[PDB]
Structures are given as C-alpha cells and as structure tokens.
Symmetry: C3
Subunit: 388 residues, 3 copies
C-alpha cells in the first residue's frame, strides 16, 4: 500500500511493518499532556498524517478531523466556536458538533439540504496519568491498557514527562530504543557519571535465538510486545578491544538499571528500572507523518500520597528531566536522525546487514507485522472517494 511491491516481496519476514510508514491504525496514541489543553481552547496536531483538532468542553476532551467537508480547509486557520457544543468553519460557516461531528447548522444557508446529512470524522480521546491519548481508528475503541506497557496505569504510579517533535520516521525511533547494542552511544552520558550507573558497552549473546527475547501474546488485557532477554544467557561487554587492545571501557558504577526492557504495540518502550533503581521509563514514538514522530517520554515512580508526589515532581524537574530525559536521551535523537537517509527510499530494510543483538529488533518487526490493528494509508489521510 505505502511501499514498492518489489521491496515488500523481499522482506517476507515482516512486510506489513515495512509497509507501515505512516504507523498502525486502530491503536491509542499519546499526543500531549492534560495540562497543555484548557477548557474551551482547542489545539491542532497531526497524528498518522491526519490533521486533528482537540477541545476540552465541561472538562472532557473531544477530537474532530481538522478538515471541513465542504472545500477541505483546516477549521483551525480561524477557529470560531460560537456555542459550547459546536465549531463553525470560518469560510462558509458549516457548523459541526464536537460530540459526534454531525453537521448541525450552516450559518450561510440554514435551509441547506446538507444540514443533518453530513458528519466530520471524530476520534475517541481519553486522559490517563495526565496524558492525552487519541484512538486513531474506526469503531469502538479497546481499553487503553491494551496499548500501554504493564504498570503504566497502576493507581500509585505517578507519571511526569516531556514531549517534542523529532525528524525521523517512528520506526527508526522504536528500533533505536529497543536495540541492545545501541547502549554504546550512551557511554559518555552525564547521567552515567552523575548517577553512578553500571553501563556496559554491549553484549556477547548466548543461548539460542528464541532465548534472546520473550514474545508476549498471552497478556490478559491483550497487550502485544517483546521483552529483550539478551542478558539472561549473554555476558555484558565492559572492555572494547581492537586487535586485542583495550581502547574503551564501560561504566563501573553501583546503580543497576534496565533489568527489564520491553517494546509494545503500537510503539512504546518500557525500561525498568531507569534512570534510577526506584523508577521506570515509558516512551512512545508516535507517528506524525512519514518523516516525523512525537518523542513522548514519561518517567513513572510509585507514590503513596501527595507528599511523595510533590517531592517526585521536584526531583523530576531539578534532576531527572535535564540529566536523564535530556542528558541521556538526546543522543538517541541524533542517532535516529542519522538513519533517515538509508531508510528514506525504503531500501534500508533490504540493504541493512544485521548482527546478533538485532534479534530483538527482528522479533519486534515480526510481532508488529502479525499483531498490529491496521496499516495507515494515504487513502485514510486524503479520505472517502466521492463520485458526485
């Protein structure tokens, strides 16, 4: 659908994933934090190539396609919300209900036969853990838990985070995050020295192929994901040699992190514990268009009361955000960016030469291929085909 059939033919193992340049339809995705959207102040964003509007009305979020049915302009060019329940296109005043997208009035012609007989696409929106999720899909949504990693929605789990737009395809981001050997790029992170981390350079794998991961399709809430098990039969590498000469060493700090690493559909990584033994990291790589994603980073820590919550928050702002989310993950950003050119023409998928630790990535590509809930296409983006 999105990629040259000749390339798709050559990746048998994982063709749906190679075709899913625009992401997977019929999943939940986080797009902003709750606190970024106030009552009666609509926001625009692009998700899976679709321009969307989000509004908060009597405290509740609603999401409309930001494209008028009439002449295809963005309503957001000049927002006119003239009743709490509605938005009016600035051009010829077609008026839509936030609740169901129905065209309920046309100010320029209240006799129009179109009234009541057209409807703008809406998507479900839910807030959880101070995060706004959109179900970019058709029909009744699944529970959010299906599309979130374990423990993210636990009652006591306190989530704080950061979001930004990054110029790479979302798959380059997923793969970088779940890539065991990419830990090499983090060897000089301020986080490593300043938080006294143990951090190898890499891994000498052991065991068989199947032992390198746990593929999860037996989670009772219907989550689908892969655990990275390279360290169970594998040996961490702390000394990097060239021709037998040690030229680089790993980090020999005390704090043990990243015991459990798992990637989940639609594209969220959970690293536990990280960046400190008492907290976890959940990060999403949300498709905006073929070239760009939201890097939606969260750190979670179980907190028992408002006191714990407020100090977590203060540590987050003074330490974990600059030192970890920025000081550790900034290198991930430019690593993703550096793979853009090779994958741009869809040929990186066939001309890459993988090595042993990439078994984790292969397992993900296969899981995503088999268990995604739909391939987003340009027809989804450009819409229904009329023959008037």
């Amino acid at each position: 659908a999105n990629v040259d059939e000749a390339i798709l033919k050559r990746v048998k193992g994982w063709a749906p994933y190679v075709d899913a340049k625009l992401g997977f339809r019929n999943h939940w995705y986080p797009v902003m934090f709750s606190k970024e959207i106030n009552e009666g102040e609509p926001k625009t964003l692009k998700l899976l190539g679709e321009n969307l509007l989000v509004n908060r009305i009597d405290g509740k979020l609603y999401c409309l396609k930001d494209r008028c049915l009439h002449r295809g302009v963005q309503l957001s060019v000049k927002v006119e919300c003239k009743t709490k329940s509605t938005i009016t296109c600035w051009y010829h005043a077609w008026t839509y209900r936030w609740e169901d997208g129905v065209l309920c009035d046309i100010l320029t012609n209240p006799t129009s036969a179109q009234i009541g007989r057209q409807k703008l696409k809406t998507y479900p929106v839910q807030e959880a853990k101070g995060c706004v999720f959109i179900y970019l899909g058709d029909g009744d949504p699944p529970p959010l838990a299906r599309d979130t990693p374990p423990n993210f929605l636990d009652d006591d789990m306190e989530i704080l985070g950061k979001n930004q737009i990054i110029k790479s395809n979302w798959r380059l981001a997923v793969e970088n995050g779940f890539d065991p050997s990419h830990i090499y790029i983090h060897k000089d992170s301020i986080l490593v020295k300043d938080n006294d981390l143990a951090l190898p350079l890499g891994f000498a794998p052991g065991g068989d192929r199947k032992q390198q991961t746990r593929v999860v399709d037996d989670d009772v809430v219907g989550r689908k994901g892969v655990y990275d098990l390279i360290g169970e039969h594998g040996v961490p590498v702390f000394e990097g040699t060239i021709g037998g000469e040690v030229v680089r060493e790993g980090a020999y700090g005390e704090k043990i992190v990243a015991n459990d690493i798992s990637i989940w559909l639609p594209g969220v990584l959970k690293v536990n514990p990280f960046p400190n033994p008492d907290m976890m990291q959940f990060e999403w790589y949300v498709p905006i268009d073929e070239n760009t994603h939201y890097y939606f980073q969260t750190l979670g820590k179980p907190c028992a009361n408002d006191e714990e919550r407020k100090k977590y928050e203060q540590e987050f702002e003074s330490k974990w955000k600059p030192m970890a989310l920025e000081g550790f993950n900034n290198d991930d950003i430019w690593a993703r960016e550096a793979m853009v050119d090779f994958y741009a023409d869809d040929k990186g998928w066939v001309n890459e030469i993988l090595f042993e630790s990439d078994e984790a990535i292969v397992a993900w590509r296969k899981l995503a291929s088999e268990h995604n809930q739909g391939i987003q296409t340009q027809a989804h983006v450009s819409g229904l085909e009329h023959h008037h």
Copy 2:
C-alpha cells in the same frame, strides 16, 4: 494533459477546467500597470508558466519569450539591448528583433547559417486603461474586449489598481471571488463598518437551478461569463443561528453594494457597485504557474474630466486602496491559500462536498470548460521538440 486521467474521468461535468492547472491559452491577461514599464527598461515576468520579457520602444510595448534558442538561458540574466530594435543574448550574442523575434545577427559568428533562419516566440501586448495585457496565445489575437468584463473599456471609465503575486492556483482565486456564501469571511472587514455597508452573512436560495445564474454566450463582442443571480429568488441571511440561537449577525448599514456579480473568461470578476455605490471592482486572477497567480485588482469610476480624475485618484490612494483593496480583500488572500492543500493532488475536485450556493461555481466550471480557447500544457512551456 495536466491531470491524472482517472480524476478527469470523474469530473465529466467540467474536465477541461480541472485539467487547466496552468490556465487557458489564447486569451489576454493583464500583468502589470503601464507606469511600471519605462522606455528602454525591459521587465521579466512569468505568465502561464512561460518566462517573458517586455520592453517599451518608441512608446510601444513588445513581448519576447525570455529563453534563448541556443542553450536555453534566460536573456534577462544579463540584458544587453545594443540597438533600439534588438536584444542580444549575454552568452554567445544571438541577437533577436523585438518586433518579430527573428534571429537577425550573431555577434560571435556573423557568418553563421542560423542567422535569419530562427525566431524566438513573441506575444501581442496592448495597453488599455493604464494596464498591460499580454495575449498568451498563437495566431492573430481577438479584440481585448472579448477577454474583459463589460464597461471596463468604456471611454469615461477611470481605472486605478494594485497587483501582487499570491501563492495559490488561479482557479482557487476565481472560485473564492465568485462564491456567494464566502461573504461570511468579510463580516468583520473594516470596510463594512467604516463605509456603512449592508452585508449579509449568506443566502437562502430560491427558484430553480437555472435561475441561480445567467450564463452569457450571447454577448456581441464574444465575452463569455456567468452572472450570480442568487439574490433574485433568494433571501439574504442576516441572522446566523446554531440550534435556533442567534450567534452572529450581518451588517445593517445603508450603502447597498454588489448588485451585479459576474465572472468572465479567462478569469476576471466584476462586482458592481463596489466598494462604494458609485464605483465598480474588476479583478483578475492571472496564472503564473500551477501554484501562483497575479491578483490584479482594479477599481473603476466614470469620470467626466481631469478634475474628477484627480479627486478619484486621491480618494483611491487615501481611502479605497487601504480600506477596500487591502482591508476587504486581504481575507480573500488567506482563504485562497487555505484551499491549497485539499486541491494540491487534484483530488479536491472529486472529494469536495458542494452545497446550494456553489451552483454559481458549477456554472463557471462548465462555462470555462466549454468556451476556453485552449488548455496550457507543460509542452507549451518547455517548447517545440527538435530531432537534430
């Protein structure tokens, strides 16, 4: 020719118009004002995708294709007019006559067998009402009147105006201008308050389909156009309601404007009277390339002598230009711009959902389809095919 055959098949009603992305060949178009081009000071512009040079020689305008026959460079990169009758290419000094485009000399080789045996394309140029029109077409031109709205060329009609380059396809501009319901976007114009205009929000149409317009193919000078008659059987809308609640009102001033609205091939709108009961507006949307047009705005007022002419001019500069041509029509510019994305892939033509007041636009699309004098193509732009 310009658009995917599959799309053209789906717009039966008006396929030539959908194909005419680059505009209609074999019409007159205004491109600048007379006062902008002085004796012996050639100017460059692009019209229907073609790079042109215009010069004034003994008071008269001439137009040459700005592309040397030899290696295809623009002569205008470095203009060398070394005799009044000629221009010399800066590269190998092929020299062309302004009057007929004939290659009359080559300074670098006066023995060349090419001399007298090659000719650059020329186009007819006429000045009228202080406006420079180019006939972008082949063969002997029609009278200018054929391609101008009624009354524009009347003896007493004094024309003043403004020109600029706007980033939309020319058809988006035509349609916006001739769109009865688009009056909604003008509801907050400074012109409306400050010139005490009556201006509805829209129209409740009445009568039959055919009564909504007058299609003109019986004009004796051969003009072809459409009058917008929505107000003859229709009722203006001054109260905009949502769920029966009045949320916006029109403008209840005294001055009645825009009694007669007509669109004419090749793409010129006449609104009478406007922006004041004693004057009219004529505006062209001239194709530059597929993405851009000249928005060539003129206001006309019958003046009996130099006294009337000079005060018209002073009102124009102090009032009508800032208040009307800018303060009213600026909103039209960004409205055009907002339709670009939907129409960019040629699919807006099939995926738009039209309503009743768009009958005027449909009538234009059909008139333009039937009565245009040719479809400009990329072959016109890139030129004659040689097999040397």
Copy 3:
C-alpha cells in the same frame, strides 16, 4: 540507466554522455588540496553521489565509503578513530581498517560472526602536485596520467589553485569551458584590461567539420581528449555588428593567450597559455551529485628551483588568484548556473539549437560517449542488493 529511454533514443550521436548525469565511474578525480588534510584528521566529501571519508595515516591517504554496513549511518556523524589503523562506527562500534575496509572488530560484540566477514568499500587515493585524487572506481586503478591533461604531471610544473562547490551539473561546466563562442561573456573581465590581453568576441569558422578539432585517442599514456582548432582555419571576430553597425569590439591588447585548448576525460580543461603567456590553466569539473560539481582550478608554471617557486606563489596570491581565477572565471560560474533550468528535465539535450562553433562541444560529447570507463548509476550510489 539515469535518463528517460525516450530522450536517450533521440541523441544517438551521444547517448552515454547524456545518461552520465552522475559522471563517469573508473576515473581519477581531484577533490581537495594535500594541505587541507592533516595527519589523523579525517575529512568527509561527496564524489559521484557517494559519501566518502579520507584520512592521512603515517603521511599516506586512505579513502573509505562513509556509510556503515550495519544500519547505513555516516561514520562521520561522530568520528571515533581509536587506533591508528581503524575507524569505529559511533553507533554499535563496528570497526573497519582504513587500509582494506575490512570489518576487523565489533566493540559491542567481539564474538559476532560478522567479524572478518564484511568489508566497507575503499577507493584508491593518490597525491600529485599538491592535489588529492580519488579513483572512483572498481579494480586496480590506471596510472593517474591517463586522467590528467598533458604537462600537468611534469617535474618542473608548479601547480597552485583553488576549489569550490558550484550548483550546476558537471557537464554544463565542461561544455561552458570548452565552448569557443562563450569568450563573449569574458569581454569585460578585469583580467582583459589589467593584463593587456588580446581577446576576440568570437570566431568565423573555416575549413571542414573535421578540421574544427583534433580528437586524441593516440596518446601513449591513454589520455582521451579533444583539441579546439577553430582558430586554424577560422578568423577571430573583433567587431560585433547588428544590421551592419558596430556595437561592440573585442580587446586589442598585446598578450596572446589560449593558443591550445583541450578537454580530456573525465572532464578537465587545459588552456595554454593562460592567464599569462608563461603559464597554463588546468580546471576540473568534478561531479558531486546530479546538481553540483567541484570547480577545481589550477594554474601551472614551470619553475626551476625554490626561488622561482616562491615568487610564483606570491604572484599567484597577489595577482593570478583574484584577477584570473576569480576575476575571469567568476562569469563562467553564473553562465553554468543559467543553463541549469533548460537541462534539468534532460530535455535541453534535444531542444537546444546548436551553431557552428558548437562542433567542439559535439566532438567532446562523442569522445566522452565512446571512451568513458563507465556510467555512474543510482545503484552504485545506494549499493549492493541483499536478500537476507
């Protein structure tokens, strides 16, 4: 391979040359000066569309493809040379030898089965006359002399020069340089007045077609090129006339230059003597990508000892560089640039109308077509096709 088959069919005379948009593979090309690359300080450049790294190790130059075999990132994003013999990719620490490109270690997994079993492409590099040449080709290189003009590699010949990136295809540059009538564009050069040059406006050719050039395929070092002989039977033009009227004259200085003009594969011009009777100019137009070339300019003067060498150098810096390489050849840069649009869609090759002095260019197009050592293609650039 690179151009629409329908266009290639129409240039029978010279189709390989029209197809060679990215240049000719299996030739030597100069890319920088020796003094620009220091011991242990690798540099990045693009040549024939390929991203390359060059390093100096124990005084000797080596060239590796700047694209990791693993995930296709540029090694140069963050260079890690951790042993003199090697470079380590910043991402997962695949480590390559400069000498043969072999993957000799992987810091992230020293047990990997890939080690010793993969190799990055290398290219031969030679320095001569203070210029760095890369053999962008496969297999054992020819002698450099094959791909350089006569006398460039003479022992006593002292070469100084300048390099920059110019935004045109390399062929537009070659043709401009070897175009006899293009001398017109140089008629106002500061060099002409300030160095008292004789410089005609052009040439009235005489003799037959074959007499206009000498095609060289009998050089014993295997050079292939064309001498421009237009002045042997032709008469220089010093008076430019339009309708018989003299409107421009040539330059009637004393110093006679450019007696011998020759173009050589892969695309180097030699003008002798120039810009002074006692020196010569050699200039390369090196393909970077389809849109851009290095304009690699050198001036050569036989020098007998260090005294002559040092004064040559001082004249070069104070006079010949600003006055000739800049003051004369700057006009060549913008002339090349002005042909870009006509040749951009590959149609200039068929829609150009050539005249008599272009016989030199035709002879080159045919020589290049017949004697080039390979057509660079996008498959060369994007690489070997794997079916893992």
